[PDB]
Structure formats: structure tokens, C-alpha cells
């Protein structure tokens, strides 16, 4: 058994962290008090003499209001007080403030509390980092944390769960700056990053769940399902993606191109009284629909470098192969010339767990497709354009420079993103 430490940074990371661990507890049969009347799950949960199952997680925010909801919440007994770290004042949507100014005053405390968790590990695999691109803390502090983690734990793999900003879901005007700034700094320290576009989850919640104006709870519960499908292989016995290393090996050919696209199916409204259960072929076909992707883009106009299929539920290997073989002769799936046109398949026999009273209906079978497509570069292009619009006038720059950051960092970060777009283009045809 090899352990995994989850790190939740800023409001987005913390709130999503809440949704994930709520789900993890439901899947493993762990009550909020920590007791488990019923190993692979020990990778995410430590055990006390009392039989309490404690999440191997760290919550960090530069202001206390978000984490305070955890300290007083349903799962207040689940986490050790040390795991919940809060500062006085936040980064004010300022990357520089979160990274340089405030980050310096709390980084040592965070690393020390993380060290506590690392000493409880017989063989730490690495870290799972949850954060937003837009927040001053989510962008600024995360990148600093990732840098220090690479120093203190060089040999440990680091995975990211990033929240891509969207105007439909409460963004600030400066969030394109923070997104580029954090991607640049974190790029060399992240082995594999799963971007989650708030616009895509917003639309999935409106389309499939019939929620006119989705809340953070609606969004996070949907995100948690995807995150759970990604980490299920680490928490259950699963011959595929058994360790953090396999994620890079199976999905990341080139170090810089470490942004796999996630696609989930099926998403059924719980209010839908009458619904027939979808077959293995039907949910597999839904993996190739842009509407079911976590990031808004067109894989039809890109090339695949890797593809992995993560099934959960009543899924027989026979039906999976029959579906894959059929899909290849009907769909337009273009792989890169230098890569094997194939699929890595993983099956978890326990069906997806859903939050009681949630918006998501219980299904017999579901699948999460992780595909490294050059089409995800569309998200970088959209983000880089917004950066260019503001940076051309040097709008809002004075705020970052005021925090100790140099003007050069902006251009340095943008040039790195420009190189990243070029890399995706070269890798196509
Ligand atoms: N999906 C999702 N996105 C969130 C959530 N909370 C915040 N966000 C997004 O995060 C971005 C703002 O960053 P925050 O995480 O709130 O800020 P922060 O990381 O706390 O940093 P500060 O600026 O110091 O408060 C916006 O684009 C929000 O849409 C959440 O619970 N779920
Ligand atoms: Mg905040």
C-alpha cells in the first residue's frame, strides 16, 4: 500500500475538496464521525486506535470564512484540526499577493503540517492539488506550494485538479492574469493536470440536470463524480492507474503536454422519474460527445496521444470490447502518427455512488474517459487572448507589481503559454 496526500488551496479547492471527501466517505462506507463498520482505501484514509478513518488531506486558505464552514460542518469530526489551516486576510484575486506577499507568511506552516501527514506514510506516492486558476490564493499560493513540494519531495508525483475560469460562474476580470501566471510557474512542477472548465459544468448542469442557475454545490457535486472516477483506481483494486506514476506514463507523452481531457457519462437528473439504464455501448459513445466534456473544445479537430476508459458498475469486459471495436469504425478518432491507436480500459465493479438528496440519479454503469487531445489547446487560446487584451494596455498590472512581482514575469509567463500553444500545434499533423 502506497499513500496519497490531497491538498486543497483557496475557496474553490476547499469547497471541491468538501464535495470529494463527502463522496469518498459514501463510497467506502465511512460515516462523517470517521467510523467505518466494514487496504486500498488506506491510500486516502489513515486509521486511529479508536477506529476513526482520517482523510490524508490538508485544507489551506488565506482567510478563514471558507474553511470555517468545514470546522462547523457535517464533517467537522472527520478532519484533524491541524489539517485545517487559515490565514487572516486573502490574496484579493491577486496572484502576486497570494504567491509573494501573503504566501511567505504561511508557506512554512503549511509545509510543516503536510510533513506531519508525510511521516504517517509508509510509502508516499505524492500529492493531489485542488485549486482555481482565478483566485489569488488558488493561483498564487498553489504555484509557491508546488515549487516547495518539488524541493522537499523531489521524487514524489504531483497531480492537479484545476478550475478553469468562466464568466458564467463568478469570475473576476483579473482571473486571465492569475491563470497564465500560475500555469507558467506550476508547469514544470506538475506531472499531470486535470482542467475543469466552469462553463462546461455549468452547461452540463443546465442541460442534463435542468438547473437554470447552478450553485457551487451543484457544480462541486458534479466535479466530485469526475474526480472520484479519476481517483477510484487509487482507492479500490484497479490494475489500471494503480499509482500516481501511471497517470503520466499512460496519458502524458511529452512533459509540457500534461493536460488530459475528461469526459463523463451518463449524467441523469434525479428528478427524472422514468429512465431506462444505458448500455455499455451507449455510455461509451457518449464519451465522444463534446457536450459531456469537462473542457469546452472540439476533439474532432485535434489528435489523440492517449486514451483511457474508466468504467464503474455492471460492466462486463465482453460489452466494453464490443463497444470500442464498433466505435472505431463509426467515429472519427484521429491518433498521432507516433502513437498506438488503442485504449487502456479499467473496470471497477461497484457502481457510482451518489449523494442522497443530490441532483444526480443513481446509475447501473458509468464511464470516465481520460484523453490527451491537442484540442484542449483551444482553452489556452481563449485564455491567452483575454490576457493579451488587457496586457496590451497594461490594465491592472500596477496591482501585481505593487506586491513585489516584476513586469517581466507577465511577459515571461505569456511567452511560455505562447510556446505551449505552439507545442500543441506541432504535435497535431
Ligand atoms: N467549481 C467551483 N469553482 C469555484 C468555487 N469557488 C470558487 N470558484 C471559482 O474560483 C474563482 C475564484 O477563485 P477563488 O478560489 O474563489 O479564490 P481564492 O482561491 O480563495 O483566492 P483569494 O483571491 O485570495 O480569495 C472563480 O472563477 C470561481 O468561479 C467552487 O466552489 N466551485
Ligand atoms: Mg478566498
Residue numbers in the entry: 1 to 38, 47 to 437
The authors write:
We have determined the structure of a functional construct of Kif2C in an ATP-like state and bound to tubulin. In particular, Kif2C binds at the αβ interface of a curved tubulin heterodimer. Our data underscore a major structural rearrangement of the tubulin-binding subdomain of Kif2C, and of the α4-L12-α5 region in particular. The large movement of the α4 and α5 helices upon tubulin binding, with a ~25° rotation to adopt a conformation similar to that in tubulin-bound kinesin-1, led also to the reorganization of the α5/β5a–β5b interaction. The movement and lengthening of α4 led several conserved kinesin-13 residues to point toward tubulin, bringing in particular Arg510 in the vicinity of Glu113 of the tubulin α subunit, Lys524 in that of α-tubulin Glu414 and Glu415, and Glu525 in the vicinity of Arg402 from the same tubulin subunit. Upon tubulin binding, as in the case of motile kinesins, the Kif2C L11 loop became fully ordered. In agreement with previous studies, in the tubulin–Kif2C–DARPin structure, the Kif2C KVD motif at the tip of the L2 hairpin interacts with the distal end of the tubulin α subunit, corresponding to the inter-tubulin longitudinal interface of a protofilament. The contribution of the L2 loop leads Kif2C to bury a larger surface with the α subunit (about 1000 Å2) than with β-tubulin (about 720 Å2), different from kinesin-1 in which the buried surface is more evenly distributed between the two tubulin subunits. In the crystal structure, the neck helix pointed toward the solvent and interacted neither with the Kif2C motor domain nor with tubulin. Whereas the neck helix orientation we found has not been observed previously in structures of isolated kinesin-13s, this orientation likely results from a helix swapping mechanism stabilized in the crystal.
